Design a protein around this ligand. Structure first.
Ligand SMILES: Nc1ncnc2c1ncn2[C@@H]1O[C@H](COP(=O)(O)OP(=O)(O)O)[C@@H](O)[C@H]1O
Ligand SMILES: Nc1ncnc2c1ncn2[C@@H]1O[C@H](COP(=O)(O)OP(=O)(O)O)[C@@H](O)[C@H]1O
Ligand code: ALF
Ligand code: ALF
Ligand SMILES: [Zn+2]
Ligand SMILES: [Zn+2]
Lengths: 673, 673
RNA sequence: CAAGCCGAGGAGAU
RNA sequence: AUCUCCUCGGCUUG
RNA sequence: CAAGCCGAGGAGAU
RNA sequence: AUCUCCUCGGCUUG
């Protein structure tokens, strides 16, 4: 039942017989089916050759593993050969090393294979080796970067290949190397100004993957052009001339606070430079142990945030954010009670809270023209996607769609999607919820999906009529991927952003980067085999050598590991909180203090299933981890300061591993009875 | 007359002189006779040593106690020493504490000993202590888990041992500790990915049992391999491609109901996630007190059940289940009479009942291939067991065997067996009936026994030629036990399940778990005695400490016990049903309401020797318990809602003890005259 | 034979 | 940690 | 479902 | 090289 198209067979012909290559075709070009056919043919050849046929497939995202196992690989190849799909969400309850030699076909995330190989090197597990495989297939090869995971596996393979090459001249016996196939659409450019540098980057990618070709379609290119229709470009610009009253009032309170705390800004208000200066002042206050510096800096950062989102988000969201932050602060202080500067800030906000609320309520936007374009397009159509910067922006957009009655009149369905993980005050989503949202959009129940960069990569959809980016541009690879994600016969590509910012210049930069992409692929494809191979060998040895010395330097970097040489103090108040030995380590990951003498210092607080800790000052410290029954008080070094026993050089790390000195584990015999 | 085999003596030699150990041999390896010989030798040594010899045997199942008392222990050891067999079914009319010091040999379920020790601690009874015994023997040691009953007894013993160890350094006098012997075949793995974690689990088991060895046969292993023949593996797969017409019609009515009640599914149809969402909506409706939510959710759950069994059961059973459920509902409503949505559901079923019956009657299965394999094997043989998920599945299989004429032509005898207890709409069986069925199968009168997980553990049979699992896999321990239960010279092991499900992956996972078992036992057996003992002591103190703080937390959890602070309302209709004090408690277990004012609210209903109660809405509430003459109306909190006097936070418990506030007992003087 | 109560174990999904 | 689904033992009542 | 830990990638500013 | 801001994967705990 397997089917092929003339361009598919043309591109895949070299790979049918050896030729460990890369295939760079646009999105929705059957690349998945090309890989499926190549796998089927390779396994058929292995069976005909009376040789073991092992195929492994690597995908950076967890979801794409299930997607391939469900839609392309298993349905077409279920009957002939055994198939299994592995992932972090999936419980590989059997093992990796033997399932390698059980099902003859593996689809797994790269990190699992990497972990298995590291375990083998450590010797704890029997482990697996690349020799066990006969064919390695990689999706989204552009991620093979300086030391990405794909790059780690490929560096191991390339060290093996270099050893094999050395033996070729030294000794006949050699370790077999599986064939390598890579699939991508935009290999990418490492921000290279010179087309020489662009082709250098392309050759670096090839060397990392040992591609020895790109093998792009040239004959049936007209057929592809007919098949795939590029979306129509559209540029939208805006100016934040309005918002004067409330913005001016907010700036006035900013200036009042700044003069109260005499902060020479050393930058213009409303920029990342100002936030960096504020954080540097945070650090300086930590090294000096004074107040009046960190609280005001954090408040200014929050107001700057509010302003930046306001340029792209409605005020109500910013005001709610600020109100929640101040509510949390007030609850902290109220719990602690049970200075004139914190009082100044809080009482200033309380006194002006009503007037600020009324002032934000008044009129005086990108939002009005965004609504105009969206509804005009929807009537002109009788799917849509929004790409933005931060998750709260997606939530605000969803709220705007729901509340506004015009969208209800149109009846467009919408839902907010965001990435997983905890990212500094954005709620972590769950993978199952992401799969649910994607499936709901696929079945047509959701007509408008708002997503962050997550949807840019993978997250394939059969068609997406409308792709409207909203103030998001990062690089050419993301731009091209998002553009190709439309896959609709009649697509509409729109970019919305402020004219003052450099975002339009960035979009045209990405356009030229795409053009330079092709300008470099066509060049590299036409190169002398001898000089070409010399370049690949050079780049391969470069990568291997760099990795070797990187490992050496990492070994040489972390060596001190002293038992106890410091005193840990509260950052807000320079008081002796803990010694260099009273701390204990559990699970080899978490830190705790068990002596009750500490319990007389900190204050437990719980308002919400794990409580938290706070200082006498109100500074948050950590949580109460319920492990093995024990409610161990875990503390985050992110909210503490260190004082070495000698010279008292105060240092703040935000992180434990950055501290070279180690702490002892918790001996449960100590807490006997 | 006692006999031993070289592997038996080899494994038992360490235990002959002290050495409180575990013995892990495959099934049917004489383990029972090994225990009998060890007991006999120990008692002979005690007599020769002029010391009291007390032996106690613990079995988790009630039936195995009688089995050991009948087949292995008493017949061989009747003459030399007194023997008695205790159990829940058996009436220990004398007492436990003195029969400990009466017959010199005890065979009892662990729970009885546990209860006696708890009574001793409470002081109500004179009680018994482990010191009274000289040897404790445990069967199926793998059940010694986080706080299993075996684990509770072993934790008490280990606290005693820790006290004795402390005295060893402090004071010469110490409390003697009886020797400990354990018998098992598959100690098990706690779903451990790392062989380090597997051996950690094994060491945890040893510490709980103080085994200090495993002592597995290594020398005569060839003799065991020759003696015991492993069954031949066989994998059977199927796809539910058929069933399209009636399944599609059922899905259509599902969709009609869902759109009528606008249930955003938040999951795919036909999965436990959908049922969980339905129950969450049950809870939400309870907190809001609206209809149109719970009835439809329950109907959808019933249809989802029907579908799931249909994948593995004939439709007629599902249709009969649905028909009985709707008949019960209609009888409820008819009794109540003597909304448009309940009417919608019931009238929809009535209108389509004839067409649904005809549609289920038509053709379009795992059943056909199951019948094929069963009959082909039976002719190829000229006993059989089926393991399944739910009891109604066993009943359907028995009906299929009886009705189908092909089995009659073969003449295979078959009967259905299931576990005891009430498990949410599956009839509770009786222990005597289970013993009857087992004896009938043993005597050869039954050639095919269908059983649930109950037959997996214990329920020993001299031989079982055929073991065919049918869509049942839970863990490696159950798999290995069932596999070894065959014990036939020429066995046939078969696993039948759908290809779409992950059941085959599970079976191979259990296979690798068995392999990892041996990979960990061989490792632990070869360990340094000092480091080993350090690990056992560590794990023992861990268990003791965890149990201590668990008891402390349990004490700290249940403290409120308020007399009357709530109002109890009907879940279906938010009406005031009872106050916080009008309820009374009897037998210290049952709850009742005595005031006749309540009798004017609920409706008594009886259709069948205890009647039941229903609301004005038709919601079932409870029964009429005939205790001490009184027909007290007992109500199940499972079908009610609570409303606290303050803040009215509605909460549903399904259970009484979960409610921390207590109710008064029934004072019979109140109901005088 | 029926009903009820207390605890415990395993699997699946959040 | 939670929810669902299955299984074991002990106790009581009739 | 919640929390925590390890690594990695991209963009911006010094 | 540093700081900031965003995203991915793996692990653990409950
Ligand atoms: N052999 C073929 N015959 C007909 N159509 C094909 C064939 N191969 C691919 N296609 C078309 O190309 C598309 C393949 O998209 P796909 O490769 O899954 O996108 P992506 O690679 O981005 O996941 C399908 O929508 C299908 O209609
Ligand atoms: N000393 C012996 N001499 C001969 N045969 C023995 C001896 N001990 C055990 N056997 C054989 O081993 C089997 C023991 O099975 P048994 O231990 O009762 O199974 P389980 O332990 O699963 O209940 C018997 O069928 C018997 O033939
Ligand atoms: F392989 Al794609 F979108 F190009 F999933
Ligand atoms: F002791 Al057995 F089956 F192994 F009863
Ligand atoms: Zn402080
Ligand atoms: Zn009611």
């Amino acid at each position: 039942e397997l089917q092929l198209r003339p361009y598919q067979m043309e591109v895949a012909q070299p790979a049918l017989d050896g030729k460990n290559i890369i295939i760079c075709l646009p999105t929705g070009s059957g690349k998945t089916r090309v890989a499926v056919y190549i796998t089927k043919d390779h396994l058929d050849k292995k069976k005909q050759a009376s040789e073991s046929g092992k195929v492994i497939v690597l995908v950076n995202k967890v979801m794409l593993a299930e997607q391939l196992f469900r839609k392309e690989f298993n349905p077409y190849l279920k009957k002939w050969y055994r198939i299994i799909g592995l992932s972090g969400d999936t419980q590989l309850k059997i093992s990796f090393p033997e399932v390698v030699k059980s099902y003859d076909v593996i689809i797994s995330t790269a990190q699992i294979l990497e972990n298995s190989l590291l375990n083998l090197e450590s010797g704890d597990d029997d482990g697996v080796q690349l020799s066990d495989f006969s064919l390695i297939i990689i999706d989204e090869c552009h991620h093979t970067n300086k030391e990405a995971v794909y790059n780690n596996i490929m560096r191991r393979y390339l060290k093996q290949k270099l050893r094999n090459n050395d033996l070729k001249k030294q000794n006949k016996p050699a370790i077999p190397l599986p064939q390598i196939l890579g699939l991508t659409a935009s290999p990418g450019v490492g921000a290279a100004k010179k087309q020489s540098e662009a082709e250098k980057h392309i050759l670096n990618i090839c060397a990392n993957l040992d591609a020895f070709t790109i093998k792009t379609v040239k004959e049936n290119l007209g057929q592809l052009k007919h098949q795939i229709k590029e979306p129509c470009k559209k540029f939208v610009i805006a100016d934040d001339t309005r918002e004067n009253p409330f913005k001016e009032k907010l700036l006035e309170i900013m200036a009042s606070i700044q003069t109260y705390c005499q902060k020479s800004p050393m930058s213009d208000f409303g920029t990342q430079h100002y936030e960096q200066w504020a954080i540097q002042m945070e650090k300086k206050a930590a090294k000096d142990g004074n107040r009046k510096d960190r609280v005001c800096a954090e408040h200014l950062r929050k107001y700057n945030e509010a302003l930046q989102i306001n340029d792209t988000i409605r005020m109500i969201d910013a005001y709610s954010h600020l109100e929640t932050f101040y509510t949390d602060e007030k609850e902290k202080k109220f719990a602690v009670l049970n200075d004139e500067t914190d009082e100044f800030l809080m009482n200033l906000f309380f006194d002006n809270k009503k007037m600020l609320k009324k002032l934000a309520e008044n009129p005086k936007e990108k939002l009005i023209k965004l609504r105009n374009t969206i509804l005009e397009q929807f009537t002109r159509s009788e799917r849509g996607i929004i790409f933005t910067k931060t998750r709260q922006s997606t939530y605000a957009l969803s709220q705007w769609i729901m509340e506004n009655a015009k969208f209800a009149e149109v009846g467009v369905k919408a839902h907010h999607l965001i990435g997983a993980g905890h990212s500094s005050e954005v709620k972590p989503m769950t993978q199952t919820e992401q799969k649910e949202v994607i499936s709901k959009f696929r079945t047509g129940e959701i007509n408008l999906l708002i997503a962050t960069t997550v949807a840019e990569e993978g997250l394939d959809i059969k068609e997406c009529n409308i792709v409207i980016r909203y103030g998001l541009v990062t690089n050419e690879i993301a731009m091209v991927q998002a553009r190709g994600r439309a896959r609709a016969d009649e697509s509409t590509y729109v970019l919305v952003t402020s004219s003052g910012s450099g975002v339009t210049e960035r979009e045209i930069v990405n356009d030229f980067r795409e053009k330079m992409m092709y300008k470099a692929i066509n060049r590299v494809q036409n190169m002398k085999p001898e000089e070409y191979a010399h370049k690949i060998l050079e780049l391969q040895v470069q990568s291997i050598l760099e990795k070797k010395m990187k490992v050496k330097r990492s070994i040489a970097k972390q060596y001190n590991d002293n038992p106890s040489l410091i005193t840990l103090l509260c950052k807000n108040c320079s008081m002796l909180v803990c010694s260099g030995e009273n701390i204990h380590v559990v699970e080899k990951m978490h830190h705790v203090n068990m002596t009750p003498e500490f319990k007389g210092l900190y204050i437990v607080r719980e308002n919400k299933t794990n409580g938290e800790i706070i200082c006498k000052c109100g500074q948050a410290w950590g949580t109460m981890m319920v492990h093995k029954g024990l409610d161990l008080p875990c503390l985050k070094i992110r909210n503490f300061v260190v004082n070495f026993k000698n010279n008292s050089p105060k240092k703040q790390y935000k992180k434990w591993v950055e501290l070279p000195i180690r702490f002892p584990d918790l001996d449960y015999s100590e807490y006997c009875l």
